[PDB]
Amino acid sequence: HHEVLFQGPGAKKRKMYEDILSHVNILKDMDPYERCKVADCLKSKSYNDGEIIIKEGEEGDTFFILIDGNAVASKDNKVIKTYTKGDYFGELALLKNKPRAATIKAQNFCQVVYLDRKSFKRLLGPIEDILHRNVENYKKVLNELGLDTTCID
Ligand SMILES: Nc1nc(Cl)nc2c1ncn2[C@@H]1O[C@@H]2CO[P@](=O)(S)O[C@H]2[C@H]1O
Numbered sequence: 001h002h003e004v005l006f007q008g009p010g011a012k013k014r015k016m017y018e019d020i021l022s023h024v025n026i027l028k029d030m031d032p033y034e035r036c037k038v039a040d041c042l043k044s045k046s047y048n049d050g051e052i053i054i055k056e057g058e059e060g061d062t063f064f065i066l067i068d069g070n071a072v073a074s075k076d077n078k079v080i081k082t083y084t085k086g087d088y089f090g091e092l093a094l095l096k097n098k099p100r101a102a103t104i105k106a107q108n109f110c111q112v113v114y115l116d117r118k119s120f121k122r123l124l125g126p127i128e129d130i131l132h133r134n135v136e137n138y139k140k141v142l143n144e145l146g147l148d149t150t151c152i153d
Pocket residue numbers: 054060073080081088089090091092093094099100101102103104137138139141142151152
């Protein structure tokens with residue numbers, strides 16, 4: 001039972017965040033304690049229509065979850081993924097310690113929650129492997145479209 005995870009001061013933030021984390025597919029699968037710790041450390045920010053969230057080729061230190069809005073990822077001007085509420089992105093640079101492999105732009109008013117590298121390494125350590133084999137699905141799209149894949153391998 002979870003009464004223990006929602007009793008203290010931190011409980012308000014813990015609770016708005018938990019329904020949300022419950023629909024981010026790869027972390028909906030973390031168990032509750034681990035997921036409550038993520039909720040504790042999330043921060044919020046917003047992007048306007050047209051703003052760049054991630055610029056391809058830059059160093060990246062931030063992991064994102066989209067909680068509202070529409071954003072789109074492209075690489076060498078090819079659309080490789082559309083994002084909506086519940087999606088996460090920006091993990092690959094944190095896992096591989098390489099520059100951002102793609103650009104992500106807001107397509108309307110977007111609200112996100114995020115973790116920095118130290119928080120991502122600390123809290124999401126238990127699942128770096130599961131996150132990592134999602135990357136194979138990234139290869140397919142890179143290949144589907146004839147784009148460079150050395151950013152992954
Ligand atoms: N087909 C895809 N290939 C790749 Cl390498 N990254 C993809 C793909 N689709 C989305 N992304 C995401 O765009 C982000 C760009 O900053 P990262 O740290 S490299 O993380 C990246 C991924 O989360």
